[PDB]
Short mmCIF file of C-alpha atoms and ligand atoms in Angstrom, two decimals:
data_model
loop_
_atom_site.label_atom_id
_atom_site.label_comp_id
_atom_site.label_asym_id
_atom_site.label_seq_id
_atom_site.Cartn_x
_atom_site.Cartn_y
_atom_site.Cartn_z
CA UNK A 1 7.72 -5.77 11.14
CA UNK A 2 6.28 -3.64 8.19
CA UNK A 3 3.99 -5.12 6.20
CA UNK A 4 5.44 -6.02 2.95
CA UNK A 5 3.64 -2.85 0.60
CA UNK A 6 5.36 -0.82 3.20
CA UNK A 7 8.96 -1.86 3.38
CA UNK A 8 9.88 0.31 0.16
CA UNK A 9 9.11 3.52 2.29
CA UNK A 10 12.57 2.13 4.41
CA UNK A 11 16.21 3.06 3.40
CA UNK A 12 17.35 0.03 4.64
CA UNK A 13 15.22 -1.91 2.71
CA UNK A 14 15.95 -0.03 0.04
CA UNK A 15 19.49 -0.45 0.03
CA UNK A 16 19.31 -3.85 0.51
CA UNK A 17 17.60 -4.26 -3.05
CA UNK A 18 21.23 -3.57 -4.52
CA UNK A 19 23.19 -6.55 -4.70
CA UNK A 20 25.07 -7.09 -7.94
CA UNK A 21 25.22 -3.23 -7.90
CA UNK A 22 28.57 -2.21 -9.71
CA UNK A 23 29.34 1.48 -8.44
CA UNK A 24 30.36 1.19 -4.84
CA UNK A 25 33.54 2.33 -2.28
CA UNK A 26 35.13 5.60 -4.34
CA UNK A 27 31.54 6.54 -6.98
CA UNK A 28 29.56 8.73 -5.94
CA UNK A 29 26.32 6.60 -6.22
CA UNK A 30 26.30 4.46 -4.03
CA UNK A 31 23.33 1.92 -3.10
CA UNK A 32 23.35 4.06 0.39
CA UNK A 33 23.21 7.36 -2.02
CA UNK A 34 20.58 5.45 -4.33
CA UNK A 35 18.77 4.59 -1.36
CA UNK A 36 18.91 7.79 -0.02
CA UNK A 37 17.09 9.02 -3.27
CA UNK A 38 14.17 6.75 -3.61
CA UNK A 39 15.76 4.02 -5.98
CA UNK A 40 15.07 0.81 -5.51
CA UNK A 41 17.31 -1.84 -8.29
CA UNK A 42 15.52 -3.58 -10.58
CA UNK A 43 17.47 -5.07 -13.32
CA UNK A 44 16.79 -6.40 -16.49
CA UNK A 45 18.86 -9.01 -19.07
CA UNK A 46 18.96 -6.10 -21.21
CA UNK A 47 19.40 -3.26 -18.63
CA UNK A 48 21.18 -4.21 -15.42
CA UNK A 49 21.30 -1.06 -13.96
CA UNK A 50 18.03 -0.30 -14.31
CA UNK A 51 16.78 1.73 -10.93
CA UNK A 52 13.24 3.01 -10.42
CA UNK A 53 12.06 5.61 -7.47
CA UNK A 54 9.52 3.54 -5.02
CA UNK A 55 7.19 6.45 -4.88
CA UNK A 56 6.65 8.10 -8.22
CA UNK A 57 7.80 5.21 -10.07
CA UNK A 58 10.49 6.76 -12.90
CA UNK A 59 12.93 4.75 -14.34
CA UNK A 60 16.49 5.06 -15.02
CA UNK A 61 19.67 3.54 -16.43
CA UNK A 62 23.09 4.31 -17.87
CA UNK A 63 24.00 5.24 -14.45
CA UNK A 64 27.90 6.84 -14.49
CA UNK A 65 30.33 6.72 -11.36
CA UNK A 66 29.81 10.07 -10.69
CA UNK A 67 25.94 10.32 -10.56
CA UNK A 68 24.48 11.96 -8.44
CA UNK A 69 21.39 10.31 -7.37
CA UNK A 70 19.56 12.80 -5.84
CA UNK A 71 20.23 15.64 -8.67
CA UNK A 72 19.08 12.72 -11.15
CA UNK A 73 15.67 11.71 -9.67
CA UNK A 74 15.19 15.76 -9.52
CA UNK A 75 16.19 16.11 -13.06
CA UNK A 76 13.66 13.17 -14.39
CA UNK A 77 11.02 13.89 -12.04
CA UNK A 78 10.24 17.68 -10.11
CA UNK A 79 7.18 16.18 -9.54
CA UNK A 80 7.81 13.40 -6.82
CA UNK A 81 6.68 14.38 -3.56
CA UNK A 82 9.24 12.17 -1.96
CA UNK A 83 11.84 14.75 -2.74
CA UNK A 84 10.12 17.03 -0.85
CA UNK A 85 10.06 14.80 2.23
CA UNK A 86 12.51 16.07 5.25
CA UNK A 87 11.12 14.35 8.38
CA UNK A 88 12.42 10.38 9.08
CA UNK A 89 10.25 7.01 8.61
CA UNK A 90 9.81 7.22 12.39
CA UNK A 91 8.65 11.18 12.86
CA UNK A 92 6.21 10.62 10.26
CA UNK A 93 2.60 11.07 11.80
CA UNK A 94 0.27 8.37 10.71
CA UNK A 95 -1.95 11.28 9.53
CA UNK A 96 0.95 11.79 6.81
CA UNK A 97 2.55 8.75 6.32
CA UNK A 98 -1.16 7.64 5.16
CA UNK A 99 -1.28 10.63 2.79
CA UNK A 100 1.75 10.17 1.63
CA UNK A 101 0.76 5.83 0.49
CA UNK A 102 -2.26 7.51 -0.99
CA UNK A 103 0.29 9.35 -3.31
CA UNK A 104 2.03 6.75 -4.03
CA UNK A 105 -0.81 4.81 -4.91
CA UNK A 106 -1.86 7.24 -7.30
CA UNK A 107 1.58 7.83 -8.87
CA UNK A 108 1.11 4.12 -9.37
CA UNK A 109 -1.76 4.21 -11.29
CA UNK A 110 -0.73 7.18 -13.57
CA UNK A 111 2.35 4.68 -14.71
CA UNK A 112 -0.08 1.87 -15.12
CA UNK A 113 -2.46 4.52 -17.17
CA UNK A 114 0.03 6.08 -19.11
CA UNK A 115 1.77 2.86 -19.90
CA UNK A 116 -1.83 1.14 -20.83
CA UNK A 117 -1.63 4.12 -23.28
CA UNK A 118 1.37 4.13 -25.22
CA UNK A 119 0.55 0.58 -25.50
CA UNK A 120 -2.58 1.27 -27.11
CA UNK A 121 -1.54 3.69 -29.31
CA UNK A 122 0.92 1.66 -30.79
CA UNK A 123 -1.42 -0.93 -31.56
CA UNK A 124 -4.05 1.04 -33.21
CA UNK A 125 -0.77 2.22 -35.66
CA UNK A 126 -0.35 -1.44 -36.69
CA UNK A 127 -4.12 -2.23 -36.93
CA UNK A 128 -4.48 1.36 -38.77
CA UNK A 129 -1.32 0.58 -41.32
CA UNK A 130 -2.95 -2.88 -41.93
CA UNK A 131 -5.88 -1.91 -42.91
CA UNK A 132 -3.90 1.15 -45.15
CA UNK A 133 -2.53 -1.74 -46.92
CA UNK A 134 -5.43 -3.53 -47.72
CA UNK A 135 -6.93 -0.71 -48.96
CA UNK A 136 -4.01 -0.52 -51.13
CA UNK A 137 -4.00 -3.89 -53.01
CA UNK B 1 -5.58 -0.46 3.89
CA UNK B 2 -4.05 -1.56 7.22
CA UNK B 3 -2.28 -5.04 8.14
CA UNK B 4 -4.58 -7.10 10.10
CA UNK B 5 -2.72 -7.24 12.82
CA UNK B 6 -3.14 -3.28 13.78
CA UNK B 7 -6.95 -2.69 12.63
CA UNK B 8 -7.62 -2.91 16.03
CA UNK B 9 -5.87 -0.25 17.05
CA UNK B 10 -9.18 2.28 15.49
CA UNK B 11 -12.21 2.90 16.98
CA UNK B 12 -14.00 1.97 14.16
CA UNK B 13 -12.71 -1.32 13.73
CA UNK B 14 -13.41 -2.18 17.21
CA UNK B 15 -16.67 -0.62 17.56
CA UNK B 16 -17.79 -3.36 14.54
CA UNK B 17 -16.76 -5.92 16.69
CA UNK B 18 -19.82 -5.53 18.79
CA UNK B 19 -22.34 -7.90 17.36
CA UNK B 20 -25.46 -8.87 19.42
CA UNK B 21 -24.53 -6.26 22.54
CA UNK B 22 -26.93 -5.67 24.72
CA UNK B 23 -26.56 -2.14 26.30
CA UNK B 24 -27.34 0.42 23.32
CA UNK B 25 -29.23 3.74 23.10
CA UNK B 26 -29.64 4.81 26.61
CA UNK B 27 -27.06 3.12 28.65
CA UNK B 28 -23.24 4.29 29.66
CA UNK B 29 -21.81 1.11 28.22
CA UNK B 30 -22.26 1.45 23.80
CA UNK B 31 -20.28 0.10 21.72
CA UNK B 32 -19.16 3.64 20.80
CA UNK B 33 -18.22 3.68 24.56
CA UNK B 34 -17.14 0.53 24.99
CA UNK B 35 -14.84 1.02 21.90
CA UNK B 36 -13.08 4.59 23.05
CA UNK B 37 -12.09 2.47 25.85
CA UNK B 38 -10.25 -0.22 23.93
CA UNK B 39 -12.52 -2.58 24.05
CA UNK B 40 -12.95 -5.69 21.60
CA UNK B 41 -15.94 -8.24 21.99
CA UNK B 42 -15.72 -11.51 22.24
CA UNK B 43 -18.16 -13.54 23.92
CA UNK B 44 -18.95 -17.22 24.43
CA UNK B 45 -21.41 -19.22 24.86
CA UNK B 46 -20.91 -19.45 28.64
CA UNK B 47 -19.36 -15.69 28.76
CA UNK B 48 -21.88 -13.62 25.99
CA UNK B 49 -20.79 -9.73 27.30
CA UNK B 50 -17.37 -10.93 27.53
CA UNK B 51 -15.20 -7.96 26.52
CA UNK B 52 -11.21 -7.81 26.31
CA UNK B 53 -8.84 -4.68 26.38
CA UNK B 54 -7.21 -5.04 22.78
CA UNK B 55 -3.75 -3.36 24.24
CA UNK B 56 -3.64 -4.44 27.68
CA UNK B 57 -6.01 -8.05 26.92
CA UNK B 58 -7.73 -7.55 30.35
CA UNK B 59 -11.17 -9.38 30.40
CA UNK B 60 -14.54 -8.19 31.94
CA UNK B 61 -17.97 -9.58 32.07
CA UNK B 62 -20.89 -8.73 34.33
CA UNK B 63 -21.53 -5.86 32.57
CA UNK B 64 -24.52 -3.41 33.30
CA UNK B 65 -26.01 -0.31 31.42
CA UNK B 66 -24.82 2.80 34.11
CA UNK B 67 -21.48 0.88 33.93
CA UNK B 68 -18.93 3.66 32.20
CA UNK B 69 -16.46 1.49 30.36
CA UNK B 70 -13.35 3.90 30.79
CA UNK B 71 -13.68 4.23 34.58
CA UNK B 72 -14.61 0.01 34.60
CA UNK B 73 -10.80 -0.29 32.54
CA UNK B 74 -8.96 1.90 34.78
CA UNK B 75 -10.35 -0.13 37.83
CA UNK B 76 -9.07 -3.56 36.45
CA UNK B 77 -6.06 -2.44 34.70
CA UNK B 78 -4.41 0.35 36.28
CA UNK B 79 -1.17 0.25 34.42
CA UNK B 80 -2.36 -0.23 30.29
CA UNK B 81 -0.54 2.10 28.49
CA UNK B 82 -3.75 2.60 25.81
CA UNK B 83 -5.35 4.45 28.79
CA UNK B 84 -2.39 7.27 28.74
CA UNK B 85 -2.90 7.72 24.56
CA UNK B 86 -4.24 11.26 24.55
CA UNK B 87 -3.75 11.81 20.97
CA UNK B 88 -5.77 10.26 17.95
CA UNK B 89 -4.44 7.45 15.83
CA UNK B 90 -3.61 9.59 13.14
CA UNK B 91 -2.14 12.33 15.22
CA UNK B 92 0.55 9.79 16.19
CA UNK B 93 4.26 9.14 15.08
CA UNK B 94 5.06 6.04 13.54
CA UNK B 95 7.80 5.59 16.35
CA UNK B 96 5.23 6.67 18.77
CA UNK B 97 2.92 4.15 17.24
CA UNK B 98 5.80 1.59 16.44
CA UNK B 99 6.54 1.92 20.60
CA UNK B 100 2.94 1.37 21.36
CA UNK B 101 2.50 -1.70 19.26
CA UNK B 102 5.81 -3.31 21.04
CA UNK B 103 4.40 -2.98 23.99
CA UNK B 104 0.88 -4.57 23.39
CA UNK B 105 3.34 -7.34 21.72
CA UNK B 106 4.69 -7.81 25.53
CA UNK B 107 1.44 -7.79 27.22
CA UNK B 108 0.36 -10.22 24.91
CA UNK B 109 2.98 -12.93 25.91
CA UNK B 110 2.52 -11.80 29.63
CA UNK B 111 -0.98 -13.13 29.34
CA UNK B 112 -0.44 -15.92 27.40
CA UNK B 113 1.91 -16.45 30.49
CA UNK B 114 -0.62 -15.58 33.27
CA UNK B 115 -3.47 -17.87 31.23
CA UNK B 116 -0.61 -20.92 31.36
CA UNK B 117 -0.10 -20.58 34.64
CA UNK B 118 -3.56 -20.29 35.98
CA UNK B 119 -3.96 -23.58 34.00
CA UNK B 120 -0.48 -25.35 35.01
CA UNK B 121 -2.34 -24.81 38.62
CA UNK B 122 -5.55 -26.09 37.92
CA UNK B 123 -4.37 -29.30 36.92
CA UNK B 124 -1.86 -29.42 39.91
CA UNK B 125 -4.77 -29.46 41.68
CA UNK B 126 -6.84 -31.95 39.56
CA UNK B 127 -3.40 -34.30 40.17
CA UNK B 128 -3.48 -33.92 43.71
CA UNK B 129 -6.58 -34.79 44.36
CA UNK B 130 -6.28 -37.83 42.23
CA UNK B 131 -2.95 -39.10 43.97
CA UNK B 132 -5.03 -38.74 47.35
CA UNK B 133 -7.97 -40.63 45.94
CA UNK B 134 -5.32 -43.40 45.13
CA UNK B 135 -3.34 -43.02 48.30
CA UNK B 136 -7.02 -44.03 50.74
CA UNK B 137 -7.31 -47.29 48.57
ZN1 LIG C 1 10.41 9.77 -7.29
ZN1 LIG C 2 -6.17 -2.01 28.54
#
């Protein structure tokens, strides 16, 4: 149905981004209780239980059996309007489901800023510390 | 912004669809009119004010300018669900919208039906008459 920008706003799609996901039957979170939070799985050679929120975009890993998703994704991000979401996908109105992808747009952009950023900085410490050692010499 | 496949489902988008219409300033039938009736152009070479329901797919040509494009769609097409929609797009619930949109899906095959039929007959006819030419030898 959805198009495919739009399937992350789904549970079901959501959940079905967890395969190879270690805590099921008996832990607390679950890929339905990841799901249920915002996460979708996005793993890594060097972190495979990495999970990020679809909406505001935070990462997280070193995810314990008795996580709580939910109190997690509050804990690294009070900001994420998707929290704050009660209704269902399908008693949305259009009116707010649009808001709500103009959001997430912009949450997008903030990690793509911010990231752009740190980036950045970091380079201008090696170009500065080069040019500190030249001076040096 | 939105998939392809539901643009026409705002006024806006179908309003642009008018290119080269005839009845402007002045006369019942504007594309503003035409439009808040559901109302797509699409004309031919044969056909030029040839204008099509984008929910229901009804066809009408022969327009004139006192024609009023809601009461012309209600004539021809009774029973098209887009004539019921009292709210505005954004007004509505993504299962109220998600219903909607299965629905034109349906009256979309139906006329693809209809349109096969009409032209299963017309070549009936075409081999008729060409088995009676052979027949009188
Ligand atoms: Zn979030
Ligand atoms: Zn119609």
């Amino acid at each position: 149905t959805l198009p495919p920008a739009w399937q992350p706003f789904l549970k079901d799609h959501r959940i079905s981004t967890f395969k190879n996901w270690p805590f099921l039957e008996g832990c607390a979170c679950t890929p339905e209780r990841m799901a249920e939070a915002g996460f979708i799985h996005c793993p890594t050679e060097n972190e495979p239980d990495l999970a990020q929120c679809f909406f505001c975009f935070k990462e997280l890993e070193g995810w314990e059996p008795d996580d709580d998703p939910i109190e997690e994704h509050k804990k690294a991000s009070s900001g994420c309007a998707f929290l704050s979401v009660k209704k269902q996908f399908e008693e949305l109105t259009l009116g707010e489901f649009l808001k709500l992808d103009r959001e997430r747009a912009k949450n997008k952009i903030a990690k793509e800023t911010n990231n752009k950023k740190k980036e950045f900085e970091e380079t201008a410490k090696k170009v500065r510390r080069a040019i500190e050692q030249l001076a040096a010499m």
